[PDB]
Design a protein around this ligand. Structure first.
Ligand SMILES: Nc1ncnc2c1ncn2[C@@H]1O[C@H](COP(=O)(O)OP(=O)(O)OP(O)(O)=S)[C@@H](O)[C@H]1O
Ligand SMILES: [Mg+2]
Lengths: 160, 134, 350, 37
């Protein structure tokens, strides 16, 4: 941080904690020892200043569809050896329970699209062959899979 | 794998046999750890500005950081005096002593003002270690 | 048997009455190796051997267990094979590259002096009543593999060469080692795909054990500590998971000999309905993804009974044999299906 | 002090160097003299 404005803002924010030890009772070593961890915690952020059940499965299926080439799909899901239908098939394969195609799942899909988690690619008028893209960071999807008790790394073709 | 662990044990034993020591010392382990780590290696490291090698620069930095961090649980002149006391086993002439003093002064200044690993606190300024060096 | 001291017999009998005899027997094998309970369990179970049977003199049911060990490098498979080589009273060690089809089996040769056709026994023939170890079995040439199936299935070899037709006994316990193609085992593929062996060869094997490599810090700590401790212990100058004290090597050998030469268990208390339902479920979940598997489980239960020195088999032997066989079977499946298999068969694995 | 010890060491080294200014061959023959028999 060489920005004068930013550094001055940081100094203004952190001065009250700087001046506490002397109030509590020119001791350079004492002040530095008391103050170092707070400075490290502040430096952790220099420039910075609960989904429904089936939504998690939709999100992980979308991530898998986006980042896994189609050729390997059966290799990961077919028991013996992106478009919306691929997403539906992957979701049906992943979930251990039989999920009915209620309109509520489509409402979830549209809500996820609105929340800017899934990006629509094709024309808005074409609602029979729609295309989607997933824009979720990998750490987020790993955390949500952990909260779901699912191991996504075992299915990611690129990592294997 | 475990094979590398056995190799490390063998290397420590080889170091022990080289020095004609009936027992193995941790210094041999520290020596072999580098050799196992290095892997890809250049022909020769470039000089650092009178010139000094990169390995010696890292060695001096490690020694000074370790001493300051140990004392944490100092002064510039006191630290230089300690260093010259520790390196007395190698210096054999007055010229080498003055060269070592020159080198340590230059290295401490360079760390203070270029690498930011050492922070000055207000002729004998206090020196502290940047809390993000491991 | 005649050379056995009565003190050996009394010590063996005193060991047999211990309720934890199995645990200490399993822990007594490979003290220098840490972990890997399943592999030593299977190898001990194969070592004790079953009871060969000849129902009617029309067909012969083998009482031998063939073990296959597929492993990622760094799992001390060769160490296990070497220990088995040392322990066995009769043992022959062979390598993959140096073993030809002619070398392993008996061959016909003209005598240099008298020049009549004579038979020279191969490794397997000298392994009769003993154990044979194959290292790097994945290196076998297919032509050399062809001759193996006959001895594996019938424990006898018929040599028809140079106008001489002879039959030789080949009752041996075979332990084979293998490494996956590419050097790493892929959990996303079937066991058949990872190993360059034909389906009949795998079918002839009774126990299959795959070993993988995982980066677990606590397990790494345990491995490092045990290895360095063993290194310190066995210096020439200086010269468990179950929590049970291992038995002495000589005592274990004497126990093995006595159990091999005294016990003949009988399967008079087996519930056929439970095994029939389990086998129907096995058929269902195998076609979703044979009789010799039943035979292997039967001889496995017989061997487990022989471990406890019991003239009659208790159903606990059957339960343990089912457990280990199911573990071996699920270990050979893809990751996408082994979770469902474990969920379905949680009754028996618990 | 460190300087005094180093100066004493340097004086000893100079004295030993003056001692070894004698021709090395004088001892080499002696070495060989023990190997000749
Ligand atoms: N789990 C383990 N516990 C203790 N020592 C081990 C273990 N795994 C490996 N080692 C040591 O590693 C050495 C070398 O292992 P190897 O037997 O060569 O590996 P490997 O699993 O047989 O694969 P290959 O056949 O060599 S490619 C052994 O002699 C052991 O000393
Ligand atoms: Mg090996």
């Amino acid at each position: 941080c060489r920005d004068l404005k930013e550094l001055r803002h940081l100094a203004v924010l952190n001065f009250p904690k700087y001046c506490e030890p002397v109030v509590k009772g020119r001791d350079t070593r004492k002040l530095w020892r008391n103050i170092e961890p707070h400075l490290k915690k502040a430096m952790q952020t220099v420039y910075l200043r609960e989904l429904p059940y089936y939504s998690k499965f939709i999100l992980i299926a979308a991530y898998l569809a986006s980042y896994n080439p189609a050729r390997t799909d059966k290799r990961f899901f077919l028991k013996h050896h992106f478009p919306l239908d691929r997403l539906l098939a992957i979701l049906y394969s992943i979930v251990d329970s039989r999920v009915a195609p209620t309109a509520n799942i489509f409402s979830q899909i549209t809500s996820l699209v609105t929340l800017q988690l899934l990006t629509l690619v094709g024309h808005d008028d074409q609602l029979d062959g729609p295309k989607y893209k997933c824009t979720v960071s990998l750490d987020f999807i790993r955390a949500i899979a952990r909260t779901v008790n699912f191991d996504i790394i075992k299915y990611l073709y690129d990592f294997l | 794998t475990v094979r590398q662990l056995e190799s490390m044990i063998r290397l420590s034993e080889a170091m022990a046999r080289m020095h004609c020591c009936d027992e193995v010392q941790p210094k041999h382990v520290k020596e072999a750890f580098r050799l196992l780590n290095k892997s890809i290696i250049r022909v020769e490291t470039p000089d650092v500005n009178l010139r000094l090698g990169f390995s010696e620069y890292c060695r001096i930095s490690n020694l000074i950081v370790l001493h300051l961090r140990k004392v944490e649980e100092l002064k510039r002149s006191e630290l230089v005096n300690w260093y010259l006391k520790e390196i007395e086993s190698e210096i054999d002439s007055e010229e080498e002593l003055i060269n070592k003093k020159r080198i340590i002064e230059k290295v401490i200044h360079r760390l203070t003002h270029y690498d930011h690993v050492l922070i000055e606190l207000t002729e004998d300024p206090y020196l502290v270690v940047n809390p993000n060096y491991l | 048997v005649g050379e056995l001291t009565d003190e050996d017999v009394k010590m063996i009998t005193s060991l047999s009455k211990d309720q934890q005899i199995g645990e200490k027997i399993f822990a007594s094998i490979a003290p220098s190796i840490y972990g890997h309970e399943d592999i030593k369990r299977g190898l001990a179970l194969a070592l004790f051997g079953g009871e060969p049977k000849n129902p009617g003199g029309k067909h012969k049911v083998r009482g031998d267990i063939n073990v296959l060990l597929c492993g990622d490098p760094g799992t001390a498979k060769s160490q296990f094979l070497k220990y088995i080589e040392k322990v066995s009273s009769r043992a022959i060690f062979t390598t993959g590259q140096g073993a030809s089809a002619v070398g392993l089996t008996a061959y016909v040769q003209r005598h240099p002096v008298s020049r009549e056709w004579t038979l020279e026994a191969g490794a397997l023939v000298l392994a009769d009543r003993g154990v044979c170890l194959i290292d790097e079995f994945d290196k076998m040439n297919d032509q050399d593999r062809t001759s193996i199936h006959e001895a594996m299935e019938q424990q006898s070899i018929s040599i028809s060469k140079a106008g001489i037709v002879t039959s030789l006994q080949a009752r041996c316990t075979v332990i084979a080692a293998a490494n996956p193609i590419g050097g790493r085992y892929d959990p996303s593929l079937t066991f058949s795909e990872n190993v360059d062996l034909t389906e009949p060869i795998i079918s002839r094997f009774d126990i299959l054990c795959v070993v993988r490599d995982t980066v677990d810090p606590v397990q790494d700590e345990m491995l490092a500590r045990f290895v360095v401790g063993s290194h310190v212990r066995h210096h020439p100058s200086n010269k468990n998971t179950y929590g049970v004290e291992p038995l002495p090597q000589e005592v274990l050998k004497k126990y093995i000999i006595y159990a091999k030469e005294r016990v003949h268990p009988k399967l008079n208390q087996m519930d056929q309905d439970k095994v029939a339902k389990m086998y129907s479920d096995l058929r269902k979940e195998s076609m979703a993804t044979t009789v010799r598997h039943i035979e292997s489980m039967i001889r496995m239960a017989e061997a487990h009974a022989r471990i406890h020195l019991r003239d009659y088999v208790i159903e606990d032997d059957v339960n343990m044999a089912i457990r280990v066989m199911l573990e071996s079977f699920i270990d050979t499946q893809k990751f996408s299906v082994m979770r469902s298999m474990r969920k379905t068969f949680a009754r028996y694995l618990s | 002090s460190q300087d005094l010890l180093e100066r004493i060491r340097a004086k000893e080294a100079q004295k030993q160097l003056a001692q070894m200014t004698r021709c090395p061959e004088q001892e080499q023959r002696l070495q060989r003299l023990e190997r000749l028999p």
